[PDB]
Every structure is written in C-alpha cells, then in structure tokens.
Amino acid sequence: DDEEETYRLWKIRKTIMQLCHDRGYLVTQDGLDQTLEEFKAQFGGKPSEGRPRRTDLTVLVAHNDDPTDQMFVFFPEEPKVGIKTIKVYCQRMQEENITRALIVVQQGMTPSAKQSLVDMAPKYILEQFLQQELLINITEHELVPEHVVMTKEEVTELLARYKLRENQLPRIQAGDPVARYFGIKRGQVVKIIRPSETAGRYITYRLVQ
C-alpha cells in the first residue's frame, strides 16, 4: 500500500542515517531520529503520483575529520538499474567531484551494471545495496556483536605485539553483510568485541581478505 511504501522509505532512510553515523560521517541527531509523521511532513505523504519521488531523498554527508570527503547516497528510479543509469550517476559524481557513493537498488541491477561498478572502482567507489537489505539494521541483532574498524597504525601495533603475519589472522569476506555495512575493503582489519561465557569479554581480530 502507499502507507506501507512510505513507511518503507522512512525506515530505509533511518537505516542510511545509522550506516552513515557508524561509518564515521557527520549526521545530525534529529536526522538520526525522524518519526513517520515528521518524515511525511518533510518529504510528502503520498509518494505514488506525489511529492517524494525517490529523487529528492539523496543525502549529503561529510566525514568528521575531513569536510571534503563528501559521500552521497542515491535512490534510482527504475527497479532494474543499468549501465545508462549508473553512467548518469557517475557523470554527476564527476561534476560535483566526489569519490564515494551508495546506490539503493529496488530489487536488483543487471550483471553488466554490477561489472561496471567493478570496472569503475579505482577512481570512484560504488556500492550496491538492495532495498530489502536496508529495511533493517543488522548491527542491532543480538547475534551480531560489535565491529570496530581498526586504523593502519593500530594494525601495525597489533602485528608487532603478537608477532603475526597477515595470513595467520582469521578472515572475513568482503561480501559479508557487516563488511558491506561498514564499507570495509580488502586488506583492512576489523576488531570484534563480544561477551564471553567463561571470561566475560573476548576480542577477536579479522582480516578482510
């Protein structure tokens, strides 16, 4: 229904705000907690043949340390995102001169488009996200523990302390849902803190490789 799809847009915007906050970017508190009525007042009440048309939902955020990181998110119109739409989005990325973006696909993009995302990867970072994936925050589940992204100096200090190579660490795939949530890439180490039945707290390090 129209009310259901309005709820869907509000919830997915809340998940985008939580993801951008967890990735280290700057979001406002009221942007973090928007109600359904407040979202409807801000963007429109009936999106079908109405005001919120999935184009005005793009978000400008910047990193806390660097105000020129300038990450956007995009909500494509068509359910099947293709090379034409991705080329339009990347050309737009070129004139506003930003490097990183998120694409929130309705159902799925074409294999040629998802390959073009890999081909465009060095200069511009493009990530595919389904609307079904972002309908809930997976980091709030009781099974999922806390994930902390480590800096390069911290990783170097860790490997010097334990006298380890990068191969000897446990691994996590780049296609992992938490890895895609944090936007981690190959070669980085994620730090997992979980409660322990026997010791109380246990810390595990995993290499994204």
Partner: protein, 48 residues
C-alpha cells in the same frame, strides 16, 4: 596450544587468542554462583 598461549593449527593460523577465551584448562574448573546477579537494588546495597 602454542607457547604464546594462542591456539593455532598446523598452518600457524590463529584460531583463538587464548584457549577457551580465558586460557584455562578444563580440569580445575568448577560450577559456582556469582551472588551479585539477580538481587534487587536495595537488597544488593544492604548485603554488600
């Protein structure tokens, strides 16, 4: 269990940083009670 007290396989890949997440063998341990989990706040303050 290696001599860094880490738990590693034959490839020297780290499986656990400490054995059983605490580094204790399974023979000397026993069932106990915390006595600080599940009293009411007033009872806990009065008792401790």
């Amino acid at each position: 269990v290696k001599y860094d007290a880490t738990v590693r396989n034959s490839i020297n890949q780290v499986v656990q940083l400490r054995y059983g997440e605490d580094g204790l063998a399974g023979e000397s341990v026993e069932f106990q009670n915390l006595a600080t989990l599940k009293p009411s706040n007033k009872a806990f303050e009065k008792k401790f």
